[PDB]
Ligand binder design. Structure first.
Ligand SMILES: CCc1cccc(CSc2ncnc3[nH]cnc23)c1
Length: 167
């Protein structure tokens, strides 16, 4: 039993809700919140900009030190950093950005990072400003993640479309 509330169950391990991931993280304080990161951990917009703003820029400060030490992530890769006031940990995961021409096949590799964590609150990878089809992202999630994932979808219209079209 966990504290996630109001989710629709899609499969044995995948759950979905129309919610602002920032507000959901502040309420649940999950062990892991997933960020829709880029390789430079520059949290300017989309989910990343919203999560970072909610930390009063502490996420960005921590991320800049991470990059200065380690260099950029790989597309499809991830790193674990602090969750600040939102969660114990933040798993920064880089899905391919279609608006940069990145290989959509890397979306499966990106979701594989979730399997290193028993329970996660997450957005749909590569959705939103990353330019991929969210219906496809949900399919890859369900077919790749085996751990317990609670997906927050900000847009109500998109949420309804994802549920109604789910096979
Ligand atoms: C600092 C708090 C805050 C600031 C700006 C916007 C938001 C909304 S969260 C959100 N944004 C984008 N895509 C998503 N997919 C699931 N959730 C989301 C919150």
């Amino acid at each position: 039993v966990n504290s996630f509330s109001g989710y629709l169950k899609l499969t044995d391990n995948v759950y979905i809700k129309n919610a602002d991931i920032v507000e959901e993280a502040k309420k649940v304080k999950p062990t892991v919140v997933v960020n829709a990161a880029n390789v430079y951990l520059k949290h300017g917009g989309g989910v990343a900009g919203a999560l970072n703003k909610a930390t009063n820029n502490a996420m960005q400060v921590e991320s800049d030190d991470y990059i200065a030490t380690n260099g950029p992530l790989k597309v499809g890769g991830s790193c674990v950093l602090s969750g600040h006031n939102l969660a114990k940990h933040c798993l920064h995961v880089v899905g391919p950005n279609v608006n940069k021409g990145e290989d959509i096949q890397l979306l499966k590799s990106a979701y594989e990072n979730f399997n290193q964590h028993e329970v996660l609150l997450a957005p749909l990878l590569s959705a939103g400003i990353f330019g991929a089809d969210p219906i496809h992202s949900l399919r890859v999630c369900v077919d790749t993640v085996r751990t317990n994932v609670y997906l927050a979808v900000f847009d109500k219209n998109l949420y309804d479309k994802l549920v109604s079209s789910f096979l």
